[PDB]
Structure formats: structure tokens, C-alpha cells
Symmetry: C3
Subunit: 68 residues, 3 copies
């Protein structure tokens, strides 16, 4: 412990930041929507999805073997 | 030290990311404002505030006992 | 290793979050643009650039001596 009780907090902070990140993307999405568009943002969405997937995978594997 | 000098950098990076996060939320807010709305975004604001509060608490407790 | 294989994952997660952060800023920028403005957001851009620079520096120095 000690140094380990820190890597848990750092991970909790990252997990929460991700919730803030997904909140701002939703906000941006509703903003593009109500002003036409949303058709040319297809590639933008793809990149967001891909990076969110990579992070979720990173967080899951970190939550995993942190207990051992 | 060594592994500890890393958890300080990782924390500094998280603290700065949070400043970038709060900058984008302000940008989104001024965007919703100048286009009517801002009345139906009450719940959105609540979630943002709550998550920002959780992070600030996480960062503060990490800054704390990192010295010991 | 062990505790170290975690600080690599935590760093990878931060690096990816930064890519998500830069994606949302681009989205916000294209939103301000197509609606006039972008002239009064000069100071906003400055702060974003400065914080992105600080993070890139933090990430680079963390990637560096993590091998030793």
C-alpha cells in the first residue's frame, strides 16, 4: 500500500474525467444537430468512438490486476 | 522516489487536463447560450458540477498524502 | 514491475484522453466558426494552446524516464 493507494485515486480521477469527457461530447453533438449538419461529422464520431473504446479498455485492465 | 516522481507527473497531467476540460465546458456553455436554450440544459449542468466536484476532491486527496 | 505495469496503463489512458480532448476542442472550434465569432475567442485559444503544451511536456517527460 501507500504508493498503491495513490494509483487507485489517480485511476478514480481518470474514470471521472472520462465521464466529464463523454458529457461534453454529448453537449457538442446536440449543438451540431440543432443547426443542420451531423452528416459531415461522421468521421469525427468514428474517431471519438474509437478513442472512447481504447480508454474503456485501458481502464478495465487497470481496475483488473490492481487488486494483485 | 523514482516510481514516485512519476505519480507526481501523472497527477500534474491530470490537473492540467482538468483545466482543459473546464475550458471546453465554458466554450460549450457560451455556445448554447447564444442560440436560446440554457434552460433545458439544467440537468446537464448538474452532472458536470457533480463530476467536477468529485475530481477536485480526488485531486486534493492525492496532492495531500503524496508527501508522505 | 507490477506497480509499474500500472503506471504505464495510467499514462496510456491519459495520452488517449488527450486525443479525445483535442477532438472536442476541434468540434467546438468549427461550431464557433460557423456562426460568426472566432474573433473574441482569441484569449480562449491562447489558454487552450498553453495547457495543451503543458500536458504534452508532462506526457513526454513521463514517457522518458519510465524505462529506467
Amino acid at each position: 500500500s501507500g504508493i498503491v493507494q495513490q494509483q487507485n485515486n489517480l485511476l478514480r480521477a481518470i474514470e471521472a474525467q472520462q465521464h466529464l469527457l463523454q458529457l461534453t461530447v454529448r453537449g457538442i453533438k446536440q449543438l451540431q444537430a440543432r443547426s443542420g449538419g451531423r452528416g459531415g461529422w461522421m468521421e469525427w464520431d468514428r474517431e471519438i468512438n474509437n478513442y472512447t473504446s481504447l480508454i474503456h479498455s485501458l481502464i478495465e485492465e487497470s481496475q483488473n490486476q490492481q487488486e494483485k
